[PDB]
Design a protein around this ligand. Sequence first.
Ligand SMILES: [Zn+2]
Lengths: 40, 167, 154, 69, 186, 306, 272
Amino acid sequence: RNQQLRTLQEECDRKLITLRDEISIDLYELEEEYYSSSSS
Amino acid sequence: INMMEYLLQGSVLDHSLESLIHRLRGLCDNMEPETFLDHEMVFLLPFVLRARRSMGAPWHLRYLGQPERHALVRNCVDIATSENLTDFLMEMGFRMDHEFVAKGHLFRKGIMKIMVYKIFRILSTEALSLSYLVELSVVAPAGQDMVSDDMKNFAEQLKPLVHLEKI
Amino acid sequence: LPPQYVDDVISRIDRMFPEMSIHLSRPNGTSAMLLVTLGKVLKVIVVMRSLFIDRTIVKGYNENVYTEDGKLDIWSKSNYQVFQKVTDHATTALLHYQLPQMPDVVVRSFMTWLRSYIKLFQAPCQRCGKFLQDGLPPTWRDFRTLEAFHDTCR
Amino acid sequence: QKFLDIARQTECFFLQKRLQLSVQKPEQVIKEDVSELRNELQRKDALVQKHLTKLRHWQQVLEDINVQH
Amino acid sequence: GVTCVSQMPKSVQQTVELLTRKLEMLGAEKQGTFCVDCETYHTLMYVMHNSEYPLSCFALFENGPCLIADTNFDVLMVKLKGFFQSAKASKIETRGTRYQYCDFLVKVGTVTMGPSARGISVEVEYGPCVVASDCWSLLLEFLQSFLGSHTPGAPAVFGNRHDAVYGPADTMVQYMELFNKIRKQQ
Amino acid sequence: PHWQTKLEAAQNVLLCKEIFAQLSREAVQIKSQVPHIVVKNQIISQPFPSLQLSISLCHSDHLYVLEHNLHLLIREFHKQTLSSIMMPHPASAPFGHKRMRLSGPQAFDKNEINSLQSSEGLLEKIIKQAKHIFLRSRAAATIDSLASRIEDPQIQAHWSNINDVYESSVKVLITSQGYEQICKSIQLQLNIGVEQIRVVHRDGRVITLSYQEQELQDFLLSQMSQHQVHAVQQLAKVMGWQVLSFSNHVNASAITVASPYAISVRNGPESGSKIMVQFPFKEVQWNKMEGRNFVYKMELLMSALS
Amino acid sequence: SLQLEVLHSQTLMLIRERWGDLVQVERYHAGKCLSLSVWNQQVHKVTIKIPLQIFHDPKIDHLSIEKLLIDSVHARAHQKLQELKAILRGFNANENSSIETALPALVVPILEPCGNSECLHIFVDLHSGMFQLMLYGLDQATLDDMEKSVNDDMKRIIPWIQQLKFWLGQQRCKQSIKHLPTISSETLQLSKNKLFIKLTRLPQYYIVVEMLEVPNKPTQLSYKYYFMSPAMALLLQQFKENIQDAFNKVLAHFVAMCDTNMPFVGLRLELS
Ligand SMILES: [Zn+2]
């Protein structure tokens, strides 16, 4: 049981990192947009 | 400060061990034991010294004096040393008579340590004995009877599988 | 850029300079954390996202590189002022070699800069003596002309 | 190369000179502002649509990793 | 890192204060008190109880194998005295005040063959890099401000390999040579 | 399983009670130049002058990045005992921190070994983090706010994707209206430390910093006026105009540009003044001159003179 | 009697977690009173006596010893805070001092305009009864030596706070020129605690400052010039111009403008 539980923690983390990875690229493109806002 | 150890030994058959490893692991507190592979030597000038290499830790050497209760105690001073010790002790004048590697698993406790292993003779590894050996080495400065007594209780717990006594 | 492309670019970097050795662990998600060793003088850990470096922690050869495991532990700064100054200079110099258009040149441009650091402790500065006011050797290479004048020197 | 730049920096100067003189009387630069601001907002919303579907897609898998536990 | 241990010889005691004053002009904070101790044996061998390495013991020979051992190595020597000749002639201990200057860790102390105090030793260990001989040019110019007109040209402990690790061990070889000269004369 | 969830809640409570006890003992027993206060279930502390830490066990505002970190941080403290690191790779040796046992016999220094053993426990490992979690906010909100307040140049912040507790990495690209290509100029990598922020300037200068929000805002404003002066220099390089005397610092920076009739300009944070020279000079005021933003108005003025 | 038992048992459980050595508990049955000895390192003693009353010798209906101890020690500290404010009143009749009521605090500004960073936050622990003052600067070692000295006796904060005002001015000048290209330094070898900066460009020129305490908190410093006559009377004219026209920002305007003029003057000297 300790073995199977460790996989779940590693499994969700792997997916959890990918969420952070994709948000990083998504945040970066968006972050530029706000500062690009002209006249406002 | 100098400490003298409390150790006492016994051996375990091959079929026996499969029950022993589970027995020892559950009885004491630990997580996922480690297989320890070390290559030990003995050095004589009479001042018998033991230097052990483990497969990236540094060469750990230890001396055991003559034995001094239900326990076997001899004054010990164990000192960690960096690499290139073997050639250092060659320039000392010490001569190496034999060297044997030991393989097995070790389990811990609050103070005491249990290590189960088999002695391999070197020429090239050969099994000197078909049964492993287990000891209960305890290191404690200014040894007192109280520490040795605790080992008696634990040994009684392990008595059924293997009955061990000092020699 | 693709994760596989990152490895190819950095693997190509190692070829140009014999002294430099690059290790690609990538502990975090698709953000290469290559480790560069300059022969024996110094080590360094740089984090980068999608082949655009953004940090440089120049830890000397003496200092440890990891913490408790293969974990690279980029954050831990150097315990010596000299490598601390190089950290800021690497942190600052990394930027000056950034060309937004091309990702390949910026990495190569930074490495030739880092490659110029193999001769630290052995090159006098053109302006004053090897050793400066403070306890730092040159610790400053020009971006284009590869000079040795110190931080206080211009 | 130097002849290239100066003859070109003179060329744009003529047009740039026209720009300010062409800024005054007509409303075209305001009209271009109407289009540019409209285009900027259109790009903003398009970025949003890229955000939501990706964000919603992630919302699904994170929930999926939860129902499985 | 890399160091150049040397000795700089009337008013020997006043020399340390004057020499420290020259160091004080540069500006270095008093960050501790180093204490290097040397022990001597017959067959010979020396164990160098060095400060700034509280655990290490640094056993060494004239020119041969050197091992770095924790503080407990000393307990072996006292207990192993039977087969050897322990504390054969005299133990030389040099204790001084640590003056670490902006990552140079330069220290000067009077070597005291207890209790004579006949010599002066300068420690100029330069932490940053292990590469030493092909980096020696740095240490000299730091020295030239500290001491006057008698800079040690080279420490001579460097065998000049193609790729050279120095580490702390070979420094104790350097200390011994300084102690050898002190022991030999007066 | 109903029995399972009932037991899980109990286990969480027993662990949670331990966490507060670990903080609660640590707060009063030791001091770190901070006035911790103990109440029934609230350990009130003041890491910053403007911050109040309500680490309050609640029995039957919530960051959840600081709260969760307590649960996980404790395990590392629990893990330090009875771990696999303690045991010696050499079969025969006393139990000890593996990295420690190899430290003594490998001649590690007086400072590194002391540093490793000087772990700060629990409260310091969280107060310092909350001492950074919000200092980040005061430096993040200011940068965000500054972009809206000042529209003449455009502050740009590319925040790093790997910012572990006790550190955060910044990018700042202060470019004018839309002249990214022709005019790329000072961009500083700001570093958010535990106590004080740390920036390294574009040209090479390193500024340590203060911790207060106001000090950061002043630094950006000072760098604001500097860029507008640099915009003159960049145009001088690319415009038919030629350079004249430059004054990077003195806060206010003044730059003079030659023409093949020159314009010499002084833009401080509070001055923003510029001139036209003819052949004896008269002032220029933009409130009536060209349109959108500073550099375009500056570029047009030069395209109006020559 | 049962209430006393609960408080003692509650106190003993309280001691196990908190105030392990800070508070000592003494229970009496002949008089049916219980005493807690807070601030064991030195005075305050809180005793519950049997209506039920609490006597302090420097309202327990809440029956929470932890809370009561906090209130009693909090009240005692505030009294200790008030006494110090009277001592700070000693140096200056016109002195700005603030005491926060949420938790013990003696944030007192040092020199004319404050930024809540120069104010040293003298707050006493409500658990150990020792004076603690923290400032953003003043390298820690100096902080500890001072806080240690002042802790035992109150009068010693009046001498040292005099020197802090000197330090804040010394520290203030360094910050302003920190972005200008210079090398700020303290006392230097020579070929009122003056500080000076030597420029990176044109190193052979030095700029020096000397400071004094004319009014109570404020300090006035006179700029001097000692470089290792030319460009001297003009500086004196510049000083008059500055007088005709914060103070540290006036310093910054003075330094860089000189740093730009002198190399230009140096070129003029080389030309002539
Ligand atoms: Zn130089």
